[PDB]
């Protein structure tokens, strides 16, 4: 069950980050109060964290 879609291109700089292409379907498992999300990228099968602004709810 997709929760979010990526709205900005995100290229990981850091080892824990989830790469995002615009429109990637995302399952957000953890929204933290530091405004990072932890998700499964439903296109790539990868998991990681990304900045909250870079996804919107579907």
């Amino acid at each position: 069950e997709q929760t979010h879609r990526a709205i900005f291109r995100f290229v990981p700089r850091h080892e824990d980050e989830l790469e995002l292409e615009v429109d990637d379907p995302l399952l957000v498992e953890l929204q933290a109060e530091d405004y990072w999300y932890e998700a499964y990228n439903m296109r790539t099968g990868a998991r990681g964290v990304f900045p909250a602004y870079y996804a919107i709810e579907v």
Partner: protein, 60 residues
Amino acid sequence: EQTHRAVFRFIPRHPDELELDVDDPVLVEAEEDDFWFRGFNMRTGERGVFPAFYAHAVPG
């Protein structure tokens, strides 16, 4: 010279990152990793990188 203004709060998870609050004036110096910007938060005087789409260009 200010180049950008933050549109969204960005709180570092990583020690090389620049914290942004909404509306913060930022001087963007360069792009590092693709769509990562190295900047100076002119309000806090801190320097670091942040995801580029957090900042919108302004005339300064």
